[PDB]
Write a protein that binds this ligand. Structure first.
Ligand SMILES: Cc1cc2nc3c(=O)[nH]c(=O)nc-3n(C[C@H](O)[C@H](O)[C@H](O)COP(=O)(O)OP(=O)(O)OC[C@H]3O[C@@H](n4cnc5c(N)ncnc54)[C@H](O)[C@@H]3O)c2cc1C
Ligand code: HEM
Ligand SMILES: Cc1cc2nc3c(=O)[nH]c(=O)nc-3n(C[C@H](O)[C@H](O)[C@H](O)COP(=O)(O)O)c2cc1C
Length: 814
């Protein structure tokens, strides 16, 4: 094509098909990779990436490569050295081979980096863009096939801790590629060199291949079990889940086993109701185009043409899927919907695990609320064995007790770089003023001083903050529970081979754990209500707590109405149910951890290098339970007057264009103006350095001009200086019909189209506003359809292509 990214994708089509059809890569896809062949590819890759990054460092400021310099995000030499130490021992430096094909690849890399740097892109593309695609699945396949530690040793090459979204980063990288100015002949040479790089990889793979040459019903009867968990897996995740489920079975009054459904004629589901309180669980991953895992293919086929009467059978299904596919959890949904068709009844709601997000968290939630539903269905209300043991330290020094820090002991006082999620830096609150002019809501602008933290950030990055619960809540809970909060103690997991030895940093007091480590504000999950039912004196409230553990029936109605919809925290539950007098250690075992909260950085590191600006709206509402609830992080930050805040910075892919001449179209209603401020700052800064800056358009939205017009004065000053080219503000509540930013974009359709088409502008969409991103998206669809004469389908294809080339970026949240 014309844009370099599309030209590279099209030019390297056949060679990519060929590379992934090589015998070595095909054996890899099928899970048949050997430790020796894996050591071979990894050593070759060490040599290759050493050469590649050597030449990258050599040309990191050459204009023909400069926009692609992403050392912190992409480079591999460090991880490859870690993996060499893993796979070849301490003296790997002389133990790793250097095959002729690897030397050919390295020689070509050095030729390019030395005498033809204009082609270096073609090689980075072939490697880095590849590592951010198939590599994510290859890492799982390796973990399972070779049996590596779950800690990630040996597969550090496949891990990008600075890239939280490889799709968005690939968009950013394509954008940086298309910025490269080059003549058409040079573009053709670059595509040919990308073909050459693919061919080098192909012949490397070829050379490395050259260097290799009893029915479960009666079974459960004789083994004495009532639970069986079939796993439909390909890369071991569903197997792991099924094994952990059947492991929880034995420690709950019941007794289960995790089995493979492949070698069992599941006609033994009709023979299963003849086991006392029997139930079967299915952890089903889905592949292909809504196709079952191979180990369940037979099973799937069996459910097609069958009529086995499965009356009185108890089942539950958890599905493993990915929201990016458009057959989301087809296998799990099919098994769930179909077992009820055959006669069985659902005990717990079907789980829908997303792999785009945190699949582990989805599964932990599902299991956590599943086990109570089982214990409350069959009525086997024995009340289960604990998981953490209380050990009070009545005489113990204070320099050994956790006082709220997150990582190592006394890490909040002995601050040493680097600072990240496990070692947050305590930034000094320099400013905390009100942006909101009215009184509808309180919107605040904080500034955090990070002078000598050595923390780097860019406009568009995010800042995460570890908050503290309101101390009045902690005191009230400690009062109504009738316990002492300053008691130094510990909770030790007696699941001995679970290296998760505590629920939170220990030893510490109950006050400290309630203040910094636990989430005492979000509505409680079903599991804590079940485990609290045994502490209710009155059988009315005990029976309420029990029934609230039923996923089916009016128990779910009660749970959703009185807890979720009413938004009752733990204190509200302890208040309205005065029968509840549980201990404090069991409560600290049942409550979920206090999560950090993310905010869009509202400053540019080029004008505010030692400061990070946050723009937030304080959460505070009258819940339907009567009480007035407060947002943890926003209330905690609101009280901060210039006063430390534990924070860290997470890289995003929201980035201004490399060329200062490129125009930007920012759209951000409400708090979504947060990053754009930074943008504008940096943009203004580029004008002050004497650089030529393109158009900078802002489409902001608020209610009233005198109510919540955030940064009105600063935006006005930016506009009058020329830094902010257009200030298009849509006031939603200044007449009878509401005016949103969609209408302002629709208004300037002609100029916007000339910016996008002729100027090659970047579009940014940001903010909380629900259903707003899709409205802006449809607006741009219509603009492109109208002004560049197109069918609606051609226009949506055009806009999607823009998203691929990193010219339509999103940063939405809730
Ligand atoms: C990448 C990312 C970027 C973000 N950037 C920003 C930003 O720039 N500015 C900003 O303000 N926030 C931002 N957020 C959201 C932020 O992380 C918090 O969710 C938000 O600030 C509130 O945090 P909190 O701890 O004070 O409230 P929490 O303790 O987390 O609880 C809030 C909950 O209260 C509930 N709730 C809210 N209103 C009502 C209501 N009327 N009635 C009933 N229930 C209600 C909701 O269920 C809500 O989830 C971002 C989030 C992400 C993931
Ligand atoms: C294990 C075999 C492989 C599989 C399953 C695989 C799969 C994929 C997939 C699904 C994509 C699309 C991602 C996207 O469009 O955003 C992709 C793109 C890509 N792959 Fe592969 N791949 C394999 C082997 C390789 C190899 C060996 C290389 C190079 C050494 C490579 C280089 C690339 C590149 C550069 C892209 C990006 C194309 C673009 O968007 O411009 N792949 N691959
Ligand atoms: C080739 C491939 C195809 C996939 N297809 C789908 C799909 O169609 N629908 C879906 O929801 N998930 C799909 N997924 C997501 C998987 O279900 C997800 O990765 C799941 O965690 C796999 O579990 P496992 O490791 O036990 O095999 C697919 C994954 C791969 C690798």
């Amino acid at each position: 094509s014309q844009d370099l990214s599309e030209a590279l994708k099209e030019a390297t089509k056949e060679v990519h098909i060929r590379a992934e059809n090589s015998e070595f890569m095909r054996n890899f896809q099928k899970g048949q990779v050997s430790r020796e062949g894996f050591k071979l590819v990894m050593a070759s890759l060490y040599h290759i990436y050493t050469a590649l990054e050597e030449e990258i460092e050599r040309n990191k400021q050459n204009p023909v490569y400069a926009p692609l310099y992403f050392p912190e995000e992409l480079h591999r030499r460090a991880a490859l050295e870690q993996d060499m130490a893993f796979w070849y021992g301490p003296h790997w430096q002389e133990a790793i081979p250097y095959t002729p094909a690897t030397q050919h690849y390295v020689k070509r890399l050095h030729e390019v980096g030395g005498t033809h740097p204009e082609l270096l892109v073609a090689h980075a593309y072939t490697r880095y863009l590849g590592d951010l695609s198939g590599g994510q699945v290859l890492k799982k396949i390796a973990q399972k096939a070779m049996a590596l530690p779950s800690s990630g040793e040996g597969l550090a090459f496949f891990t990008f801790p600075s890239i939280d979204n490889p799709t968005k980063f690939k968009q950013l990288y394509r954008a940086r590629m298309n910025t490269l100015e080059m003549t058409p002949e040079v573009k053709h040479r670059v595509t040919e060199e990308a073909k050459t790089a693919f061919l080098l990889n192909i012949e490397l793979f070829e050379e490395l291949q050259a260097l290799l040459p009893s029915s479960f019903v009666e079974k459960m009867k004789k083994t004495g079990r009532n639970i069986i968990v079939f796993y439909g897996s390909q890369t071991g995740t569903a197997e792991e889940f099924a094994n952990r489920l059947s492991k929880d079975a034995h420690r709950y009054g019941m007794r289960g086993m995790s089995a493979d459904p492949e070698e069992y004629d599941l006609a033994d589901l009709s023979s299963l109701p003849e086991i006392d309180k029997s139930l079967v669980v299915f952890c089903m991953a889905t592949y292909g185009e809504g196709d079952p895992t191979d180990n369940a293919q037979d099973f799937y086929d069996w459910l097609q043409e069958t009529d086995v009467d499965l009356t009185g059978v108890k089942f539950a299904v958890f599905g493993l899927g990915n929201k990016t596919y458009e057959h989301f959890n087809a296998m799990g949904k099919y098994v769930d919907q179909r077992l009820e068709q055959l006669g069985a009844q659902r005990i717990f709601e079907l789980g829908l695990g997303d792999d785009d997000g945190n699949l582990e968290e989805d599964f932990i939630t599902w299991r956590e609320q599943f086990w109570p539903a089982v214990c409350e269905f069959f009525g086997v209300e024995a009340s289960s064995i604990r998981q953490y043991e209380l050990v009070v330290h009545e005489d113990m020094d204070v320099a050994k007790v956790y006082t709220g820090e997150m990582g190592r002991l006394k890490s909040y006082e002995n601050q040493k770089p680097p600072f990240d999620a496990k070692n947050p830096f305590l930034a000094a609150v320099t400013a905390n003023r009100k942006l909101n002019q009215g009184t509808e809501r309180h919107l605040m602008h904080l500034e955090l001083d990070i002078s000598d933290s050595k923390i780097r950030y860019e406009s568009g990055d995010h800042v995460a903050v570890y908050p503290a619960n309101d101390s009045a809540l902690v005191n009230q809970i400690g009062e109504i529970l009738g316990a002492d909060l300053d008691v130094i103690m510990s909770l030790n997991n007696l699941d001995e081979e679970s290296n998760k030895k505590h629920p939170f940093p220990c030893p510490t007091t109950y006050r400290t754990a309630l203040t910094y480590y636990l989430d005492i504000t979000n509505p409680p999950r079903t599991n804590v209500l079940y485990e609290l039912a045994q502490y209710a004196s009155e059988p009315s409230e005990q029976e309420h707590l029990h029934k609230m553990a039923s996923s089916s029936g009016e128990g779910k109605e009660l749970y959703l109405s009185w807890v979720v919809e009413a938004r009752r925290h733990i204190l509200a539950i302890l208040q309205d149910y005065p029968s509840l007098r549980p201990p404090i250690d069991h409560l600290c075992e049942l409550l979920p951890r206090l999560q950090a909260r993310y905010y869009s950085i509202a400053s540019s590191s080029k004008v505010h290098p030692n400061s990070v600006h946050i723009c937030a709206v304080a959460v505070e509402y009258e819940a339907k339970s009567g009480r007035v609830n407060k947002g943890v992080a926003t209330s905690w930050l609101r009280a901060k007057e210039p006063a430390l805040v534990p924070m860290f910075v997470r890289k995003s892919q929201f980035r201004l264009p490399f060329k200062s001449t490129t125009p930007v179209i920012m759209v951000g209603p409400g708090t979504g103006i947060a990053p754009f401020m930074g943008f504008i700052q940096e943009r203004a800064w580029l004008r002050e350095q004497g650089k030529e800056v393109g158009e900078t358009l802002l489409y902001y939205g608020c209610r009233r001009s005198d109510e919540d017009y955030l940064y009105r004065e600063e935006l006005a000053r930016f506009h009058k200086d020329g830094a902010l080219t257009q200030l298009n503000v849509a006031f939603s509540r200044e007449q009878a019909h509401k005016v949103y930013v969609q209408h302002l974009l629709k208004r300037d359709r002609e100029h916007l189209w000339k910016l996008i088409h002729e100027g090659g502008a970047h579009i940014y969409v940001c903010g909380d506003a629900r259903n707003m991103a899709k409205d802006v998206q449809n607006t741009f669809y219509d603009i492109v359809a109208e002004f560049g004469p197109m069918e609606h389908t051609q226009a949506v294809d055009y806009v999607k292509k823009l998203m691929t080339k990193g010219r339509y970026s999103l940063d939405v949240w809730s």
